[PDB]
Each structure stands twice: as structure tokens, then as C-alpha cells.
Design a protein around this ligand. Structure first.
Ligand SMILES: [Mg+2]
Ligand SMILES: [Mg+2]
Ligand SMILES: [Mg+2]
Length: 803
RNA sequence: UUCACAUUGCCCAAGUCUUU
RNA sequence: CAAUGUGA
């Protein structure tokens, strides 16, 4: 229940493709290096201040201690040198003055780089984390002081240009950096990125950008409360400088001319003490420091401090500008990374040099294989087979494997009759019925009910009327004007209060229909009503299907940046047939920002019970695709969640012990793959083709992991999903697990495309997002209330309501 | 709220200090 | 999922 399995073999399936990865090979010396523990008092200092302290300390005490030695430092408590310091094992207390600190330096160990080499060649069974940590500190040392660290990235203002976003914000470009072991060598993983920062500009200019002034001379008088409040929202919490740096905690209500402190005015204080006559005395002051004290700075003497990341959500226009500034095709992204590596020149970093490290300036070459897609079987008379090409197929001249006959359905139009007229509704209905008949999901007649309504209050009484009036009602089609709170109310009432299938459609897609939008709509309707859109070609499936097996997908979704109290949402879905096509869902609220799925045992039990009810088989294997767990959480998550799956089995039946395969899926990581050969680039975005698989060179030196880019890249640079097998009772070969994973990406019911993660994992995201919708403005008695909100109706429990 | 892909928002990571 | 783009 602990150590991940070794890689069983390497995959052999599929034609080869030449790739380049944004991994840059490192040459690491084979010497010991030294680790010292540092303590700085006071210790409440920001990491960057600590780095400054240790910098001043090293230069100052070079005589006593650091002769020709260039230490690296993590900004907390860890210091490394390439040669021993003349300290012994003895602690030393050092006094360092910073333009006032006590610093103790105590040795703690020797880190062997030889051992890391041995572990990379699979001699040693495991990778020494602390050694990789040391190398990371070496590589981060100088950029952490030169640039602004954000996460594992570094950002700086661009030289020679500006990317304003408006509102006092601008784009900064930067790069991700991390050190990774691989089958080949140590690798430096580098990617480019961009994020929003506040412009270092005078606060007066900041005010102008936020209140949409061309100049401040526009604002004759004091600000309106409306303006002053808008300004306060934007600058509160930001750092400003006058030498002195300060955080802003408020904006005064009174202008500097009449704002007073004990008792004297602000404008008069600066006249007398600093011999300064304010322009703009009609403007308010920033309050800074302790909000309980009374330190006020006129706007005119303040600059926004450089290098503060913007944490607040961008406006829609700012987002537009950001996308426009940063979107790149895959070849353009590849060239940006390569260009950055040639300019970064890691090898003349004197700390990199001190530690004898070399970094290749060219991307690693790696060979991929492009897996063949499964064939897709449809139904009706013809039982048509679709063949995916470059990640896509379509349903033209095909009928659903099992299509639902729709006999009783209603329309509720919450869009205004003046815009979405009865003629629109009639036309939409005629076109929908045509497409549905072609798909083998015949809508046998007109709806039983078609009415206009307005506002969230009308939803529940209408739906109760419908449920009570129309026996055999299968579907309510709900037309919505655009973004509206009515949508969340429809899903509260449908999914959780009354247990009724609903399909919402925006008015614009009723007013003007296309065959492709209507066809996609039918994919969802058939699914919601219990149909089987299509199945993997049965004889083309891997051998795991010869015995009963259940596929689980699991995700936790965390609340947005800055949020302090909302729950995290855990979702787990399980397959319910042998195809595998149909799924049931479970969902829970749990502790804020907890990744481990707390109630997983109960959720899996529910799904196992429903699987047996649906198939009359007990799974001999459980294949668990777990989304979104980072490497630094693998052991904690595996420990709880593998045992929770076992617990669900044991409590169902004594000696019921199906084999478990536990696979982490990670869409968001920093590995990018590019075609080496221009003639392999697919489409306008120039990405690798769907089915591109990598399990050599850049993957783990001992464990069982692979990249699989299962989808067609439409825009930008494709994220190749990564799969790490943390447990495998079933002893899959690489080929069989890779092919299984790819085939499951072709079972997602909402589109005739291979998607970027397996259908079970994708459904878990949809379930979590629907629960978030059930919680809008609602997020022990507390836990109970949130838990009630996400519990679907008894009649919804067994459905694919989340599609 | 037709759908996918892509950017950001999500665990790990990162971040958080003292004269008006 | 939401904001924004690219597409079918
Ligand atoms: Mg997640
Ligand atoms: Mg943390
Ligand atoms: Mg969107």
C-alpha cells in the first residue's frame, strides 16, 4: 500500500515519431556537497529578505568563513556549498547588518551526488529526494534574487516593450524551471509563461488608469464616493514606496488638505516637516502600515512598488488582451523556449559554475509512438463503424448504439418572447427532430407543453406542474437568454429537488441552428435519457475486458484563488457496463483545499453496488484514474485512497479482493512535446498527432509512467497528459495500459473526438463542476448544509445528469 | 447554457516583516 | 465550470 511498482517493460505498439521535449540535459559532478542549517532571528522575514541577509553575510564574512566559496541558499534554513566551510561541525553565531540580524550556521550533512547517479542508473532502488532538492536550490539561487519568483517560475518586466492591460496592470513574461530525474540524465525542465503584474508607476498614474482618466486634471474636485470606493478596492493590500516601503490598508475619506492626524492636517504636515507643497490636495491619502494607527501618505509622494503579482481576477477586457499577448502555436512556443535557453545561459551562472553543473542548450530528442485509435461502433440497422483520423470522427450516416425514443417532452423558454419567438421555437424543434431521427433517437412528436416564463421564481412551480401533470415525461428542454441565475435554479430543481432530466440551450442556438450544434446537443440528450451513444469495437479492446472490470475516475476541485472558506469538492464516477460507456456519479463536499478524497470508501462502495445492480457481475479488477495529484502528494494520496478502495471491497464482502490499478492523471504539468520534423506538425497549431505516446528518455528512471497526448491539438500547444501508475495488482504491460488509456479517451459521450484525458476522469470534473453550480451563493451544521446541497434526487442518482 | 482544444483560476509549490 | 480566444 506504499511503494509504486517498477516499470514492467517498454511499450512497442504504434509507428515511431521523432519528438523534442522542453527538457534540457544536465551534467552533474560526482562529488559530495555540504548542507548547513541556518537560523535567522528574527524569523518572520519574507523569503526574499532572508536571501538578502545571507548575501550580505557571505560577502561580509568572506574573510573568516567564505574564501572563494559561493554558497547557495533556499531562503529559509538550507545552505549548500561545493567545498567544505572551515566551520567544522560547530555552530557559529554571526551578526549581520542589513541596509540587524543574528545568524547561526550549523552543519547538518553531506549530500552525495554520486548516489544520485547510481539511483538514475537504477542501481539504487530509489531517488534521493534531498539530493534533488539540493540541485534545485543551486539552480534557483540567482534567479530568485534577480527575478520575481512565483511558484516554480520566475518573472521579469520585458526589456524594450510594454504589455499594458489597463487598470494599472501589465503582462510580465517569465519561465518555469524545475530539476527532474529521468531514465537518461538529470533534466532541467524549462517552459515559458506569462502573468499579470502591477506596473511600477506613480500612484497618481495608477489612480488615472483605474478611474479611466486621461490625466488627473480631469478630476477637478474630490472623488465621488463611487470613484473613491472603486480606487480603494484596487489599491488596498498593495505595497507602495515613497527608501520606505508600505502596504496600503485603506484610503482616507477626506482629502489631504483636510485629513488630520494627532492634531494636524496631512497637507500641512508635509509643508512644515518636508517643505513640500502638494499639488492635488483635493485627493485622498493612502493609509498604510497598522490599520489601527494613523500613517497617511498623499498619493503624490507614492509609487506602486515594482514586482507585485496581480492576484485578483482580470476583467474580461484584460483577459482578452492577455490571451492576445500570449497565445502561440506549438512551433512558436518551441522557438520561444529554445530562444530563452540560449539567452538564459545557465552555464555562466556563477553558482551553477561553483557546483560544476553544465546544462545543454538544446531540447532533448525523444522518440514517441503514435498509437492506433480504436474503431467506434454505432447502432441502428447498419451498425456503422467509425474510424478516428487525427483524433476526430463524426456521426454522419450513423445511429446511436442504443438510442432513446422520446415520446413525452416539454419546452420551457425563459428567454423573452420578443427575441425568442414562437417561430424560432417551432423552427428549432423541427430541426432538432430531423437531426434526432437521423441519429436514431427519434423525437416522435411535438412537445406536450411549451410555455414562456421569466425569472428564477418560476422554475420550481413550473417543474412541479410538469412532473405532476405529464406521465412518462422524459425531458424538459430549457431555453435561456444567455448568462442567468435561472440556469443554476434549473439544475437545483431538476437534479436535486425533483429528479427530472433537463437540457438547457442558449437562445442564440435556438434562433440560429446548425447541424453540428444540434447533433452535439443530441449526444447529450441521448445520454441523459439513458442511451448508449456508441461503444468501443468489442473485439478491438485490450484483454482486461475478458473479465468484469470497473473503471473509476476521481477528481477534487478546489475553490478559486483568494478564497478562504469554500469547500473543496470530491467527485468519483464508475463505469456501469462492459462497453464501457455508461457511468454513475458520487460527489462530496470536503475540507477547504484538501486534495485527499476524505469519503472515498463510501463513494466506491456506492459505485460497486450500482455496478453489480447494473451488470450482475462483481468486478475482478478496479482501474482508478485519479486526476490532478502532484508528485509531492503521491504517497499521502495513495496511502489514504488505496486503502479506502480496499476498505470499500472488504466491507462489501469477506475475501472480496479485486486487483486495483491506481493511476494518477496529470494534465497540468510543464512538459511539452514538439514534432522534430515539420511534416509531422498537424494543422494550423502545428501540434503532435493524437495518440503520441512517450515512455522513454524523459520519464521516471524506475517507476511506471508515460505521456499520452490523446487529443487533436486545435490551438496553442497541446498539453500531453501524464499517467503515473502508483499501484498495480493487475500487472499490466506498458502496451496494454497505454492502449487501454487511449481507448478510454474515445468513450467520452459529449463529442465524436478523442479527448485529452480518459472519459472517467473527464466525467469526474463535470460532476464536481455541477456540484459547484448546486452550491452557488450557498458556500458540522455547516457541513451538513453544504452536503445536502450537492446530494442529487433519488431518481437522479443512477443517471448521467452531469453530461 | 452544443462541443472540444488552448490561457488563467485548483493539491504540492509559491506567497506573508518594521514617523504620520 | 467561469472569463477569453481558436475551431467543428
Ligand atoms: Mg482536481
Ligand atoms: Mg504549502
Ligand atoms: Mg469557454
Amino acid at each position: 500500500a506504499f511503494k509504486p511498482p517498477p516499470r514492467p517493460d517498454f511499450g512497442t505498439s504504434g509507428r515511431t515519431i521523432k519528438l523534442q521535449a522542453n527538457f534540457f540535459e544536465m551534467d552533474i559532478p560526482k562529488i559530495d556537497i555540504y548542507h548547513y542549517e541556518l537560523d535567522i532571528k528574527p524569523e518572520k522575514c519574507p523569503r526574499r529578505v532572508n536571501r538578502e541577509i545571507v548575501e550580505h553575510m557571505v560577502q561580509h564574512f568572506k574573510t573568516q568563513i567564505f574564501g572563494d566559496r559561493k554558497p547557495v541558499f533556499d531562503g529559509r534554513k538550507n545552505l549548500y556549498t561545493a567545498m567544505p566551510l572551515p566551520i567544522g561541525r560547530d555552530k557559529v553565531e554571526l551578526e549581520v547588518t542589513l541596509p540587524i540580524f543574528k545568524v547561526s550556521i550549523k552543519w547538518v550533512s553531506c549530500v552525495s551526488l554520486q548516489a544520485l547517479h547510481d539511483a538514475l542508473s537504477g542501481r539504487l532502488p530509489s531517488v534521493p529526494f534531498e539530493t534533488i532538492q539540493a540541485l534545485d536550490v543551486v539552480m534557483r539561487h540567482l534567479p530568485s534574487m534577480r527575478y520575481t519568483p512565483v511558484g516554480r517560475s520566475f518573472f521579469t518586466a520585458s526589456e524594450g516593450c510594454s504589455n499594458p492591460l489597463g487598470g494599472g496592470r501589465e503582462v510580465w513574461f517569465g519561465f518555469h524551471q524545475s530539476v527532474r530525474p529521468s531514465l537518461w540524465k538529470m533534466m532541467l525542465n524549462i517552459d515559458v509563461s506569462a502573468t499579470a503584474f502591477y506596473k511600477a508607476q506613480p500612484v497618481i498614474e495608477f489612480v488615472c488608469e483605474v478611474l479611466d482618466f486621461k490625466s488627473i486634471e480631469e478630476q477637478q474636485k474630490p472623488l465621488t464616493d463611487s470613484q473613491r470606493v472603486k480606487f480603494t478596492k484596487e489599491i488596498k493590500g498593495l505595497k507602495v514606496e515613497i527608501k520606505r516601503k508600505y502596504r496600503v490598508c485603506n484610503v482616507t475619506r477626506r482629502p489631504a488638505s483636510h485629513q488630520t492626524f494627532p492634531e494636524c492636517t496631512v497637507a500641512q504636515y508635509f509643508k512644515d516637516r518636508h517643505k513640500l507643497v502638494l499639488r492635488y490636495p483635493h485627493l485622498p491619502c493612502l493609509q498604510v502600515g497598522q490599520e489601527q494607527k494613523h500613517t497617511y501618505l498623499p498619493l503624490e509622494v507614492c509609487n506602486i512598488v515594482a514586482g507585485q503579482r496581480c492576484i485578483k481576477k482580470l476583467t474580461d477586457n484584460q483577459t482578452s488582451t492577455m490571451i492576445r499577448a500570449t497565445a502561440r502555436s506549438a512551433p512558436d512556443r518551441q522557438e520561444e523556449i529554445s530562444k530563452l535557453m540560449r539567452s538564459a545561459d545557465f552555464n555562466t551562472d556563477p553558482y551553477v559554475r561553483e557546483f560544476g553543473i553544465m546544462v545543454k542548450d538544446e531540447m532533448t530528442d525523444v522518440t514517441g509512438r503514435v498509437l492506433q485509435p480504436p474503431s467506434i461502433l454505432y447502432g441502428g440497422r447498419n451498425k456503422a463503424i467509425a474510424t478516428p483520423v487525427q483524433g476526430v470522427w463524426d456521426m454522419r450516416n450513423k445511429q446511436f448504439h442504443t438510442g432513446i425514443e422520446i415520446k413525452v417532452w416539454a419546452i420551457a423558454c425563459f428567454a423573452p418572447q420578443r427575441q425568442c419567438t414562437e417561430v424560432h421555437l417551432k423552427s428549432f424543434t423541427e430541426q432538432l427532430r430531423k437531426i434526432s431521427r437521423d441519429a436514431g433517437m427519434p423525437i416522435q412528436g411535438q412537445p406536450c407543453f411549451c410555455k414562456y416564463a421569466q425569472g428564477a421564481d418560476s422554475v420550481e412551480p413550473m417543474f412541479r406542474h410538469l412532473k405532476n401533470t405529464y406521465a412518462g415525461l422524459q425531458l424538459v428542454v430549457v431555453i435561456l437568454p444567455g448568462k442567468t441565475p435561472v440556469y443554476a435554479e434549473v439544475k437545483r430543481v431538476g437534479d436535486t429537488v425533483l429528479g427530472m432530466a433537463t437540457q438547457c440551450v442558449q437562445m442564440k442556438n435556438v434562433q440560429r441552428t446548425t447541424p453540428q450544434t444540434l447533433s452535439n446537443l443530441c449526444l447529450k440528450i441521448n445520454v441523459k435519457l439513458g442511451g448508449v451513444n456508441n461503444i468501443l469495437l468489442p473485439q478491438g479492446r485490450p484483454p482486461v475486458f475478458q473479465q468484469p472490470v470497473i473503471f473509476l475516475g476521481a477528481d477534487v476541485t478546489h475553490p478559486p484563488a483568494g478564497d478562504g472558506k469554500k469547500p473543496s469538492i470530491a467527485a468519483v464516477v464508475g463505469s456501469m457496463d462492459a462497453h464501457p460507456n455508461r457511468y454513475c456519479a458520487t460527489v462530496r463536499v470536503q475540507q477547504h483545499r484538501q486534495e485527499i478524497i476524505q469519503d472515498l470508501a463510501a463513494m466506491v462502495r456506492e459505485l460497486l453496488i450500482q455496478f453489480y445492480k447494473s451488470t450482475r457481475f462483481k468486478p475482478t479488477r478496479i482501474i482508478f484514474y485519479r486526476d490532478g495529484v502532484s508528485e509531492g502528494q503521491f504517497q499521502q494520496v495513495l496511502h489514504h485512497e488505496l486503502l479506502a478502495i480496499r476498505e470499500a471491497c472488504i466491507k462489501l464482502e469477506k475475501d472480496y479482493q479485486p486487483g486495483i490499478t491506481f493511476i494518477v492523471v496529470q494534465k497540468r504539468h510543464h512538459t511539452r512535446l514538439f514534432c522534430t520534423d515539420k511534416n509531422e506538425r498537424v494543422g494550423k497549431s502545428g501540434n503532435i498527432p493524437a495518440g503520441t505516446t512517450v515512455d522513454t528518455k524523459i520519464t521516471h528512471p524506475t517507476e511506471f509512467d508515460f505521456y499520452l497526448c490523446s487529443h487533436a491539438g486545435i490551438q496553442g500547444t497541446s498539453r500531453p497528459s501524464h499517467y503515473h501508475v502508483l499501484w498495480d495488482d493487475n500487472r499490466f504491460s506498458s502496451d496494454e495500459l497505454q492502449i487501454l488509456t487511449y481507448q478510454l479517451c474515445h468513450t467520452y459521450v459529449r463529442c465524436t473526438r478523442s479527448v485529452s484525458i480518459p472519459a472517467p476522469a473527464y466525467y469526474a470534473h463535470l460532476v464536481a463542476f455541477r456540484a459547484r453550480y448546486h452550491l452557488v451563493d450557498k458556500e458540522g451544521r455547516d457541513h451538513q448544509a453544504l452536503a445536502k446541497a450537492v446530494q442529487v434526487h433519488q431518481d437522479t442518482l443512477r443517471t448521467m445528469y452531469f453530461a
